[PDB]
Design a binder for this molecule. Structure first.
Ligand code: SKN
Ligand code: SKN
Ligand code: SKN
Ligand code: SKN
Ligand code: NA
Ligand code: NA
Lengths: 199, 220, 203, 196, 214, 213, 204, 199, 197
């Protein structure tokens, strides 16, 4: 898997590949790893499929009731703490990383890391097996003040670059743009991926 | 062990402590870790004491055969290569970690040789269980083209930091200065611990020990 | 350790070694390996030192509590059975304790061997510890039920003495007790090398 | 390591057991009894691991005694064998399993003599004759050879001696003396110990 | 935590005349990977005490949460009593030992610096409940590289000024960046004096690579 | 796999005299080949007539020490009197055996006065077995100092020797000389010797120096 | 440990113009004592002795393989070996088995043949020579021996003082070792004579 | 370690970081991993220091005698086969990767990979622990027809990008430019490294 | 598991060994001899692992016999014990080590009676009395108690009887018969087997 989130002025862009594997076998080649936790709050799934889906199901439930009690959309910090606490309490039994990003009236567009029960805000963040091969790329390619389109292009290029190199990553790139107005869903097909040196 | 090397304006300084440990017990309070290879090549040994002793003895003996045949002063590159090719062959089972310092026609040189047979040419180095205490002093205060006494001082301080900070190191600081004109073996150059004094009243009056048998063999 | 106990015409002789070791190091040259539970009830100790001390002190507490409840002393059979039930509750826990519950009650002299497994044997002769085999050899050779109190003190003295000689985990002193009808009497606390030297010097 | 034997006749059950209480390489006791009277007409012979045996046998004994006191009559050898099995089998998958191998001999007024064999796993088998321990490997074939269902007690005692003599000739373990007992219509009868 | 994930390296500490200074790089490593090069590993506990932490970051963040709340809890009372640096060190020792005894340690080695009633405080607590006070501390690999330099200076001059202590810490961070393969050239210097706790960052030590030309 | 123990070294020693008891220790605390601190004395004052020496895993040393401290207060509140040296020893055995299956990796040597005002020493193993002693050594250099205590303080292996009982002055000189020998040969013993003296008058502390390496 | 299978202890000590060597006499397998008169010190010259602790089979083997080389050496050289040279002979003999060694840790005690100036040393099981100017120990009770030697040893000890010191350091050390004992033997090596004494030691 | 080689018209550019570690300890912080095998042939060392130096010592020896017998400078293919054969024969006992690059009158500037006894010619190649984090970068940044200077910046940027992310990589960067004219040696100090996003 | 015993007097050596050849839980033989005559005045009693014992003892026997044929005189008990020791110790670090435990008894015209103890590691000890096997744990202390160096052969047989009786009373192994032999100035003399019926 290769997951990625990028903050911009009015919100966030989140991306993921589409490969679900079981050893060297592709089980699902078109999985959408960008799972909604609330209207305007999403998480990118990685690691154990069963663990990631379980944590997402519980976080969306906790956040739904939290939102209805505060008579307000939950804060992205609250959604990040929700996921983080589950990942931390069960870190010995869970083997999943759920990146949390979205939008708020208070702090606007924010990107969070939940790796092993930790919590960290990032201008952009990457995860999954595929992220290992694009650290140098994202370090060279990231520039602050990127537009939502520039964020989608940074996310698409970085994920395609990882998809080529990583056996556990491939398929299609799913893009999601969370903003005050709402959420936009894009899909970049395996035919339409950006091309780079592949020999 | 805390063994260390330095390359100054007119040569090389080699430092070593005097502790030999046998599993948390100090066996020797003053052993010699700076060994002769050739008149202007010395080597510090750290690790399994028999392995450092014998690999240093063998290369010194090979360098005597080298110099006798060539008729020239040995090169420090030769001692480095003879040592590496021997250690590599033994796949790290010969546990000698060495600091080779010396002066030949091409100037002063300092090398680190590891038990598996890897080496590097360095301006300063430290090996042994106390290498990090010495390497901190060297990194903190090494400047190139130092004077004889500035380097001697820095080296003493580097070995002393290891003597005090490493449980596997202690005793005195032995040192060797190597210049174009030869080597000065400064044994017990520094003693970070002043002579330990007791009020020893452990005299046994003759006869206290019960003897069962006594045979005396006169000699000539 | 080397503990031994034997019934005979004049009661029950109980002798113990005094060595405690940690690997090859001797932690204690002299340790008391006999708990005096009451004037008529003793316990010998071998195995894990902490297990021996705590468990036998727990039997003693229960023996003392029995006397306060009934106004009578506990029998040798109930005290030995009590200890083996404690051991049984901690089966598989890794306890190590070998003991002989020696005493005198309404049914005469009593000697029981109790083990960490919950073994409980009544008998007229036992030996426990790392040197028990050496003690059994000397004891068996000179034992006759009609032994004098002084002749039995020599049999118990020599049995431990020779076992400390061959067993590296036995040494120090012999602590020997004689269990009579009106309670025990601590016979002696004698240095084993002095005894061995006395026997060597007699050759 | 220990030895148990049973030979059931038309109207009696003959049983024998070694008398050694051993620990490590030493024979601590030469006069150790391994049979536990459960009822007037029931004996439970029990062999196995160090503590487990007395602990298990005595729990069954006390419960068979509690049945006698509670109801006024005793358990039958069948009910007493099945009750022994229920407890052993219930501990099998528990934290504390008992490593006991036992034999239950008994005489019922309605069903006659019965001899039962129980595994340490708690498999229960009714057998005309049985043996437990390494000694069973050397004696089950002697019993196979000479045992007949009409065997008189005097003849069974002779057959038992041949099995015990076989352990002296070929068994590496020193089993010198054995307890011998017969259960019949009049109860448990102690016979002379077979000694060597 | 039986197996740490993101870990922090050495945390440095040295008391001076009028307070204590503590230092730590801003790196979280996933093995050899410098995964987070800008995370703070230092925390202001209260007005007199500050804590730096080596080892697992998720466990440090958890302790930062638990401590942070304890301070808030105390401050609601407003009774003129507050946790001394020494009391935070005592609590933290009991906290680590308790988790260690349940065979579920918090994978950290921490340094607590403080200043209460004119006295400087510097205490060490590890994942097993081993605690002690010292004039200078260095966790992790720093116990081999930096502690010999701190002790070397403290042997010559036992009482250091705030400036001498600060320059000594900058010299130690430069050595650690050269020698520790799990360090980064980005760090924080936190100082506790009469005025209270002051965390400074991000800092970097100038490097010299002239030895490459030798 | 995580190990809940670490060896932090250090040597403790106690001597029971006619009207006194000495409990002494080095001040070194270490781990591996590192020194944590050079000022870590292993002597803990429990009552005005009872001192304890603790050595082994420092985490367990700190804990067992706070538990002993808390238990004495509890006993004082319950009985309206201070625990005697013998009651502290008997209690420590039960506390140590309460951890029979997850021991306190601590070597304890209690030293103080008995109810007759004489010297009392009680020595323990990590799991709770103890006995009263004339003297005893514990900790990293335990095996170096114990044979010399057996000889010089117990008069062992000496025939035709006058058995003069040890005086406070003579025992203090012996503690100072044995810790100097322990510091010469044991890597875990050094920096300083902390000595606690217990007499009818109370507790005094003396601190002599040992090798820094 | 392999070295603790047989047990035992050996020690050597320097004096004025004399040198001492001592060892226990136990021969046992694990916790069982077999004999009380096992030889662990072997003469290598008039004033030169070697003591071997450790595995009894390798104590005997090393002493015999060393005597073979020594005899050949003295025959080819026409001289009695110098103490330092015997140390180098043992180091080379032991180091030959570096990757499969003999389980013995020797101790050498002798007087120089011209100066009569003492010499003491010890070698680890792989033949690492170590000369000291005070004492050397080797055995299962090395920790006990170091404690006794460090406390009891004094610089210029007369032969009589050296005898009391090495005797007391061996007796009290070995008396705290379960697998060492059954008597102690001491050799005092002077220019004029060798004095061999067996001490009256504990037998447990 | 992070090693890299790039082919260009008149030859090759080879680069390496300078870290030599032993666990988490930096043993030598300024070691030159670009070892000459012949006048215009070099190899970049990675993996076990003892194994890499041993193979290089033997390859330089075999190539020196080979060159003197053919009365010609050895072909870079011959030097690549020399290194490959040693790495292949001893692949169970060696744990080093020696990249081989240089110049020839025949084939000009060539880059070879020797990983585990294999042989492959590459337009550019990367190696060592640090290479794992710059695959996506080199895949995006490589363009054919690069000048020697462009090759040097590419090599500098990719190695600095890996040095920052890799704990086993660091120090200075050593650059080497092998051409018909000769060999050029450059050293980019830790102070002069190119800067990218490092948070 | 097996049993060897030796008691040396002023002018003789008394030795005994069990007669059991056993496989698994069965006593295959009741009349098994474990002593091997090396010379006219030397016996090698040998116990240990399954094959190792006969293989090792017979190799030494034939080599001691080859010495007699080669030189016209026999090895002394000392030279024969040291030769046994050299071979056993030489196989120790080899592919094929022998798991054998033995006693060498013998009588020399110059040095008198000698009894040697050797474990499988090849440590050689000269002892006034010795025993091998688990039985040695129950009998070494009986020998410690009653053995004196002036013990007459008639008395040494009563001592050996006390040791063998101890194995019947306390040893868990069935060892009911034993071979008994005395070596003196006139060679090896077979005595009556000590049996327990
Ligand atoms: B990814 O490779 O990490 C992917 C992410 C993921 C998360 C939530 C839900 C899904 C699909 C239901 C996928 N996870 C996987 O592909 C993993 C295997 C994996 C994990 C880490 C690295 C590489 C590969 N898939 C499973 O665990 C799984 N899927 C199907 C059947 N069994 C297990
Ligand atoms: B040093 O402390 O690492 C030391 C080096 C040494 C010792 C004596 C003499 C020389 C010169 C030939 C060098 N090493 C030892 O003390 C070693 C054990 C060791 C190994 C690795 C790390 C720490 C310690 N000790 C011995 O080899 C030894 N000790 C006693 C007697 N003989 C040998
Ligand atoms: B004995 O050897 O079985 C002995 C028994 C013993 C020791 C001390 C105190 C008592 C009763 C108060 C009994 N046990 C030991 O010596 C054991 C080691 C041992 C165990 C089994 C067989 C042989 C030896 N030693 C300890 O338990 C111990 N040693 C040091 C410190 N604490 C405990
Ligand atoms: B690199 O990190 O792979 C580096 C490259 C290298 C090649 C030849 C010679 C040297 C210096 C003498 C270094 N190799 C190392 O740093 C290795 C360890 C390593 C290996 C693989 C990944 C990361 C690190 N160094 C050693 O093996 C070593 N160095 C000194 C002492 N002992 C071992
Ligand atoms: Na003994
Ligand atoms: Na030191």
């Amino acid at each position: 898997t290769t997951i990625m989130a990028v903050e911009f002025d009015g919100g966030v862009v989140m991306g993921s590949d589409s490969r679900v594997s079981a050893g060297e076998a592709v089980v699902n080649r078109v999985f959408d790893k960008l799972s909604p936790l609330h209207e305007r709050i999403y998480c990118a799934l990685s690691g154990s499929a069963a663990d990631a889906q379980a944590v997402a199901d519980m976080a969306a439930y906790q956040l739904e009731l939290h939102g209805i009690e505060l008579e307000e959309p939950p804060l992205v910090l609250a959604a990040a703490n929700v996921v983080r606490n589950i990942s931390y309490k069960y870190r010995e039994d869970l083997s999943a990383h759920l990146m949390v990003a979205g939008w708020d009236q208070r702090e606007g567009g924010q990107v969070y890391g939940t790796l092993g029960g930790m919590l960290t805000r990032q201008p952009f963040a990457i995860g999954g097996s595929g992220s290992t091969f694009i650290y140098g790329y994202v370090d060279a390619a990231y520039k602050p003040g990127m537009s939502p389109e520039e964020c989608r292009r940074f996310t698409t290029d970085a994920i395609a670059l990882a998809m080529s190199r990583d056996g556990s990553s491939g398929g299609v790139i799913y893009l999601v743009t969370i903003t005050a107005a709402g959420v936009d869903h894009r899909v970049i097909l395996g035919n339409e991926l950006p091309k780079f040196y592949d020999e | 062990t805390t063994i260390a090397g330095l390359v100054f304006q007119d040569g090389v300084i080699l430092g070593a402590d005097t502790r030999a440990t046998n599993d948390s017990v100090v066996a020797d309070k003053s052993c010699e870790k700076i060994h002769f290879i050739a008149p202007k090549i010395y080597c510090c040994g750290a690790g399994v004491a028999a392995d450092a002793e014998m690999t240093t003895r063998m290369v010194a003996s090979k360098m005597e055969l080298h110099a006798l045949s060539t008729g020239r002063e040995p090169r420090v590159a030769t001692v480095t290569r003879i040592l590496r090719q021997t250690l590599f062959r033994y796949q790290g089972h010969v546990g000698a970690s060495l600091i080779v310092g010396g002066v030949d026609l091409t100037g002063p040189q300092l090398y680190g040789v590891h038990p598996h047979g890897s080496y590097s040419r360095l301006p300063f180095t430290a090996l042994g269980s106390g290498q990090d205490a010495a390497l901190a002093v060297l990194e903190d205060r090494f400047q190139p083209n130092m004077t004889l006494e500035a380097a001697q001082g820095l080296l003493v301080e580097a070995v002393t930091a290891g003597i005090l900070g490493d449980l596997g190191s202690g005793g005195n600081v032995d040192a060797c200065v190597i210049t174009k004109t030869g080597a000065k073996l400064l044994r017990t150059l520094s003693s970070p611990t002043e002579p330990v004094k007791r009020s020893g009243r452990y005299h046994f009056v003759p006869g206290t020990t019960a003897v069962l048998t006594q045979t005396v063999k006169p000699l000539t | 350790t080397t503990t031994l106990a034997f019934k005979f015409q004049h009661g029950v002789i109980a002798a113990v070694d005094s060595r405690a070791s940690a690997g090859s190091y001797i932690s204690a040259l002299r340790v008391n390996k006999v708990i005096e539970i009451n004037p008529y009830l003793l316990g010998t100790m071998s195995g894990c030192a902490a297990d021996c001390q705590y468990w036998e002190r727990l039997l003693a507490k229960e023996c003392r509590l029995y006397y306060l409840r009934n106004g009578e002393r506990i029998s040798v059979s109930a005290a030995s059975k009590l200890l083996s039930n404690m051991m049984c509750q901690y089966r598989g826990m890794g306890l190590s304790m070998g003991s002989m519950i020696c005493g005198w009650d309404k049914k005469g002299p009593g000697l029981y061997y109790v083990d960490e497994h919950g073994t409980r044997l009544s008998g007229n002769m036992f030996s426990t510890g790392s040197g028990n085999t050496y003690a059994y050899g000397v004891m068996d050779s000179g034992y006759r039920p009609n032994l004098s109190p002084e002749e039995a003190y020599d049999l118990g003295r020599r049995a431990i003495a020779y076992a400390t000689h061959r067993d590296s985990y036995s040494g120090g002193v012999v602590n020997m007790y004689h269990m009579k009808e009106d309670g025990w009497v601590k016979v002696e606390s004698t240095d084993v090398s002095d005894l061995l030297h006395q026997y060597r010097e007699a050759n | 390591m220990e030895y148990l034997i049973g030979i059931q006749g038309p109207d009696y059950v003959l049983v024998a057991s070694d008398r050694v209480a051993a620990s490590n390489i030493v024979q601590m006791k030469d006069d150790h009894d391994k049979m536990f009277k459960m009822s007037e007409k029931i004996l439970l012979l029990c062999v196995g691991e160090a503590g487990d045996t007395v602990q298990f046998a005595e729990y069954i004994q006390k419960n068979v005694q509690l049945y006698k006191m509670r109801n006024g009559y005793e358990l039958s050898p069948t009910a007493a064998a099945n009750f022994t099995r229920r407890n052993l089998a219930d501990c099998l998958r528990s934290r504390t399993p008992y490593h006991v191998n036992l034999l239950l001999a008994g005489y019922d007024e309605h069903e006659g003599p019965a001899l039962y064999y129980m595994d340490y796993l708690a498999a229960l088998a009714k057998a005309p004759f049985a043996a437990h321990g390494y000694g069973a490997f050397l004696t089950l074939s002697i019993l196979d050879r000479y045992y007949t269902p009409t065997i008189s007690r005097e003849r069974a005692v002779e057959l038992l001696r041949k099995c015990l003599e076989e352990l002296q000739k070929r068994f590496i373990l020193n089993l010198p003396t054995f307890s011998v007992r017969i259960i019949d219509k009049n109860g448990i009868h102690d016979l002379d110990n077979i000694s060597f | 935590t039986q197996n740490p994930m993101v870990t922090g390296t050495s945390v440095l500490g040295v008391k001076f005349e009028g307070g204590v200074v503590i230092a730590a790089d801003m790196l979280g490593s996933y093995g050899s990977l410098a995964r987070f090069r800008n995370i703070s590993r230092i925390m202001r506990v209260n007005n007199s005490t500050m804590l730096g932490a080596s080892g697992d970051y998720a466990d440090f963040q958890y302790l930062k949460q638990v401590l942070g709340q304890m301070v808030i809890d105390e401050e609601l009372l407003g009774d003129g009593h507050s946790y001394s640096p020494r009391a935070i060190h005592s609590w933290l020792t009991r906290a680590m030992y308790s988790r260690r005894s349940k065979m579920n340690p918090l994978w950290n080695t921490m340094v607590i610096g403080g200043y209460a009633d004119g006295e400087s405080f510097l205490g060490y607590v590890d994942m097993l409940g081993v605690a002690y006070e010292a004039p200078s501390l260095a966790t992790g690999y720093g116990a081999y590289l930096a502690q010999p330099l701190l002790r070397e200076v403290l042997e010559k001059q036992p009482v250091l000024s705030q400036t001498e202590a600060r320059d000594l810490v900058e010299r130690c961070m430069r050595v650690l960046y050269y020698r520790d393969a799990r360090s980064y050239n980005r760090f924080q210097i936190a100082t506790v004096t009469e005025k209270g706790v002051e965390i400074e960052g991000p800092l970097s030590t100038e490097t010299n690579w002239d030895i490459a030309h030798m | 796999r995580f190990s809940p123990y670490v060896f932090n070294g250090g040597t403790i020693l106690a001597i029971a005299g006619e009207d006194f008891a000495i409990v002494a220790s080095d001040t070194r605390l270490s781990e591996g080949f590192s020194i944590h601190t050079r000022d870590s004395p292993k002597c803990y004052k429990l009552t005005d007539k009872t001192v304890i020496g603790c050595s082994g895993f420092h985490g367990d040393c700190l804990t067992l020490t706070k538990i002993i401290e808390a238990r004495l207060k509890m006993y004082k509140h319950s009985n309206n009197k201070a625990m005697t040296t013998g009651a502290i020893a008997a209690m420590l055995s039960t506390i140590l055996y309460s951890r029979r299956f997850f021991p306190y990796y601590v070597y304890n040597i209690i030293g103080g006065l008995d109810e007759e005002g004489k010297g009392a020493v009680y020595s323990f193993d990590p799991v709770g077995s103890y006995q009263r002693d004339s003297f005893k050594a514990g900790g990293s250099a335990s095996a170096m100092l114990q044979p010399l205590l057996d000889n010089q303080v117990g008069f062992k292996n000496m025939q035709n020797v006058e058995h003069v009982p040890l005086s406070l002055d003579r025992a203090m000189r012996l503690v100072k000389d044995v810790f100097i020998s322990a510091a010469e040969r044991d890597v875990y013993t050094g920096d300083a010797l902390r000595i606690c003296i217990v007499t009818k008058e109370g507790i005094r502390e003396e601190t002599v120096s040992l090798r820094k390496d | 440990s392999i070295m603790s299978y047989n047990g035992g202890a050996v020690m050597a000590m320097k004096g004025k113009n004399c040198v001492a060597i001592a060892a226990d006499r136990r021969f046992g397998i694990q916790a069982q004592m077999v004999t009380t008169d096992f030889q662990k010190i072997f003469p290598m010259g008039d004033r030169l002795y070697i003591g071997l602790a450790g595995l009894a089979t390798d104590v005997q083997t090393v002493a015999q393989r060393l005597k073979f080389r020594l005899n050949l050496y003295e025959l080819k050289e026409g001289r009695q070996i110098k103490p330092y040279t015997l140390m180098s002979m043992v180091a080379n003999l032991l180091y030959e088995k570096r990757f499969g060694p003999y389980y013995t840790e020797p101790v050498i005690a002798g007087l120089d043949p011209k100066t009569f100036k003492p010499f003491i040393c010890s070698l680890d099981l792989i033949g690492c020579p170590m000369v000291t100017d005070d004492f050397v120990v080797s055995g299962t009770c090395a920790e006990q021996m170091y404690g006794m030697c460090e406390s009891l040893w004094e610089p210029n000890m007369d032969p009589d003082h050296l005898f009391e010191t090495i005797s007391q350091a061996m007796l009290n050390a070995v008396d705290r070792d379960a697998v060492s004992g059954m008597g102690v033997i001491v050799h005092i090596i002077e220019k004029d004579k060798i004095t061999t004494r067996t001490l009256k030691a504990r037998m447990d």
